[PDB]
From a paper:
The functional human SOD1 is a 32-kDa homo-dimeric metalloenzyme; each subunit consists of 153 amino acids and contains one copper ion and one zinc ion. The misfolding of human Cu, Zn-superoxide dismutase (SOD1) in motor neuron cells plays a crucial role in the etiology of the disease. Instead, it has been proposed that immature forms of SOD1, which lack copper and zinc ions and the disulfide bond in the structure, are the origin for cytotoxic misfolded conformations. Substantial experiments have demonstrated that the full-length apo SOD1 can convert into amyloid fibrils by incubation with reducing agents in vitro.
We produced amyloid fibrils from recombinant, full-length apo human SOD1 (residues 1 to 153) overexpressed in Escherichia coli, by incubating the purified apoprotein in 20 mM tris-HCl buffer (pH 7.4) containing 5 mM TCEP and shaking at 37 °C for 40–48 h. The cryo-EM micrographs, two-dimensional (2D) class average images, and atomic force microscopy (AFM) images show that the SOD1 fibril is composed of a single protofilament with a left-handed helical twist. The SOD1 subunit within the protofilament stacks along the fibril axis with a helical rise of 4.82 Å and a twist of −1.187°. We unambiguously built a structure model of SOD1 fibril comprising the N-terminal segment (residues 3 to 55) and the C-terminal segment (residues 86 to 153) at 2.95 Å. The density of an intrinsic disordered segment comprising residues 56 to 85 is invisible due to high flexibility, which is reminiscent of the internal disordered segments observed in the structures of patient-derived amyloid fibrils from systemic AL amyloidosis. The SOD1 fibril core features a very compact fold containing thirteen β-strands (β1 to β13) and an in-register intramolecular β-strand architecture. Three pairs of intramolecular salt bridges formed by Lys36 and Asp109, His43 and Asp101, and His46 and Glu100 (with distances <4 Å) are identified to stabilize the intramolecular L-shaped interface between the N- and C-terminal parts of SOD1 fibril. Two pairs of amino acids (Val14 and Asn53; and Gln15 and Phe50) from the N-terminal segment and two pairs of amino acids (Gly130 and Asp125; and Arg143 and Gln153) from the C-terminal segment form four hydrogen bonds to stabilize the fibril core. In our SOD1 fibril model, Cys57, Cys111, and Cys146 are all in disulfide-reduced conformations with free thiol groups, and misfolded and aggregated SOD1 evolves from a pool of immature SOD1. Once apo SOD1 dimer converts into its fibrillar form, the SOD1 molecule undergoes a completely conformational rearrangement, with the antiparallel β-barrel of apo SOD1 converted to β1–β5, β7, β8, β11, and β13, the loop between β4’ and α1 converted to β6, α1 and the loop between α1 and β5’ converted to the internal disordered segment, the loop between β6’ and β7’ converted to β9 and β10, and α2 of apo SOD1 converted to β12 in the SOD1 fibril.
Residue numbers in the entry:
A (entry chain B), B (entry chain A), C (entry chain C): 3 to 55, 86 to 153
Write the structure that this text describes.
């Protein structure tokens, strides 16, 4: 009743067991459910090390970030996602005037979104 | 009744067990549920080390950040996500005037969003 | 009852077992469910190391980022995703005026989206 048994010589390292025992039941909801994810797979082991017996992002770029265990819920309803502007104009001159309109805004720059966001703008 | 048994020689390291015992039942809600996530997978072991017997983000960039165990809920309803402006103009001169309009705003820059956000703007 | 048994010589390294025991039941919902994912596969082992017995993204580019264990739900309904602008104009001069209209906005640049986002704009 174990994961490893050791008789010979040598010191030891990562040996794991892990359980995650999950039992649903009956639910019985009347209507609708939306936004429902069901996933079961986790095993990522980039490098084991070893037994004995130059990274550069130049413009705007990121380096060495790693996120886990993060949930973002913003489902909502009847939503507008994006850029919007509702400038409203008319000219209608009468006399010795001269009607011109430009309604400039102004430049922007130097933003970046890294990681786990949702809406990034 | 164990995870490892050790008889030979050597000192030991990470050996783990972990349980996460979860039992639902009956729920019986009438209506709707939205924004519902169901995931069960965790195992990430970047590097084990070893047994014995130059990172640079230049412009705007980030370095060495790692987040876990974080939840953000802002679902809401009837929402507008994005940039908005409602300048409103008209010209209608009569005489010896001259009607011009520009309504500039002003530049912006030097913002960045890193990690786990939701709405980043 | 184990994963490895060791009698000869040598120190040890990663040996794992992991469980993920999941039991559904009856659900019985009346209506609709949308956005439903069911996946079960996890095993990624980039490099084991070894037993003994120059990366550059130049323009706008990223470097060495890795995300896991992240869920984003923003399903919603009746939504507009993209750029929008509702400038509204008319000219109708009468006299000695002269009706011109330009409604410029302003340039933008230097944004980038990296990782796991959802809506990136």
């Amino acid at each position: 009743k174990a994961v490893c048994v050791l008789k010979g010589d040598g010191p030891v390292q990562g040996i794991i067991n892990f359980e995650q025992k999950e039992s649903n039941g009956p639910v019985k909801v009347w209507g609708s459910i939306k936004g429902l994810t069901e996933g079961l797979h986790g095993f990522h082991v980039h490098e084991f090390g070893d037994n004995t017996a130059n990274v550069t992002a130049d413009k705007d770029g990121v380096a060495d970030v790693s996120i886990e265990d993060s949930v973002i819920s913003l489902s909502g309803d009847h939503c507008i996602i994006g850029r919007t502007l509702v400038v409203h104009e008319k000219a209608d001159d009468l006399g010795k005037g001269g009607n011109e309109e430009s309604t400039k805004t102004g430049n922007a720059g130097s933003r970046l979104a890294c990681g786990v966001i949702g809406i990034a703008q």
